[PDB]
Design a protein around this ligand. Structure first.
Ligand SMILES: *[C@@H]1O[C@H](CO)[C@@H](O)[C@H](O)[C@H]1NC(C)=O
Length: 333
């Protein structure tokens, strides 16, 4: 009932890419769905770099609906260990057989040791709030809702890379992806999907907090994060260890349980959820944001270290009501 599902493929490069149709006749791209940004980015045939040609570049000159901006524009965005640069235009998009017209987006013209030489990047569907927009005034999701008034203003993520059942849902939730009830956390500022965080314990060790702190739900980041000061204390109590696929469950049996405190809601992260196997070793799926950015004082919750265990729901606040993030135990299989 007004809730369509977008299957998310888990690529070898740790990406969770969906499907997005651009232009008319439509051209298929496989972007990531990122609550950590808001711009809509598409890799285009204007980018002649090696990391671009390896993917199915969108050709704007073969689309009847492409509308380049009247004025030449250039947008440069940082994307991890790399950067994205390009122009601005409008296009018709189709997501899950739902159309969005007159949508502003960035045309990747350059991707210049580079993160793009390791992934098959084809674009970004930003799901953050409009204040983070630098390409356009109306966000893709808001524009999708306005042109499809039958949809409830919410989306959710089910992350299950084991059986390739990961799914991005628009318009609501489905009991087939979570167990129990959904706990709603109010968003403190409509910019990131950011909520209050009362504390963090690794076992009995207090990691957070000494200042009033916040968590950010960031589907575009695989690891969880902590500020640099707290990351040092985390790694002092959570070690890496030699691991194989045949003993990782034994190695991690008595690792510490991580507790995130959201008021009265206690969110547990188990060792097999925040630890990952990498090069014959169990390593924690945690990192600090060493690059100066707007997120370096928050606690990011990512796809691998959080969303594998918890079904996440994102509700856009209507009128004065604030937006909220919902969390529930994901259902296996
Ligand atoms: C898109 O813009 C055109 C003008 O170029 C306008 O005629 C049309 O109604 C717009 N469509 C939507 C869905 O806003």
């Amino acid at each position: 009932e007004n809730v369509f599902l977008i299957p998310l493929k888990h690529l070898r490069d740790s990406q969770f890419v969906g499907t997005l149709l651009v232009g008319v006749p439509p051209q298929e791209i496989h972007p990531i769905f990122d609550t950590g940004s808001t711009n809509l980015w598409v890799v285009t045939t204007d980018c002649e770099e090696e990391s671009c040609k390896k993917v199915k570049r969108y050709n704007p000159y073969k689309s009847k609906t492409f509308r380049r901006s009247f004025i030449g524009k250039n947008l440069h965005i940082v994307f991890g260990s790399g950067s994205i640069s390009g122009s601005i235009g409008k296009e018709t998009f189709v997501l899950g057989d739902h159309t969005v017209r007159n949508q502003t987006f960035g045309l990747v013209e350059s991707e210049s040791d580079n993160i793009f030489d390791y992934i098959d990047f084809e674009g970004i569907v930003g799901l953050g709030f409009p204040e983070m927009l630098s390409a356009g005034k109306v966000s893709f999701f808001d524009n999708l809702l306005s042109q499809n008034k039958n949809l409830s203003p919410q989306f959710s993520f089910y992350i299950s890379p084991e059986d390739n059942t990961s799914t991005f849902l628009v318009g609501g939730v489905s009991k087939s992806f979570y167990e129990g009830s959904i706990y709603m956390l109010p968003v403190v500022k409509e910019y990131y999907w950011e909520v209050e965080l009362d504390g963090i314990y690794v076992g009995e060790k207090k990691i957070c907090c000494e200042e009033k702190s916040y968590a950010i739900f960031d589907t575009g980041t695989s690891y969880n994060t902590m500020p640099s000061a707290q990351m040092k204390g985390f790694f002092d109590v959570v070690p890496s260890a030699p691991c194989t696929e045949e003993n990782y469950q034994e190695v991690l049996k008595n690792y510490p349980v991580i507790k995130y405190l959201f008021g009265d809601l206690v969110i547990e992260l188990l060792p097999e959820e925040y630890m990952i196997l990498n090069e014959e070793s169990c390593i924690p799926a945690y990192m600090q944001i060493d690059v100066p950015s707007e997120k370096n004082h928050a606690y990011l919750l990512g796809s691998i270290a959080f969303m594998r265990h918890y079904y996440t729901v994102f509700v856009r606040g209507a009128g004065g009501q604030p937006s909220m993030v919902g969390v529930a135990k994901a259902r296996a299989a």
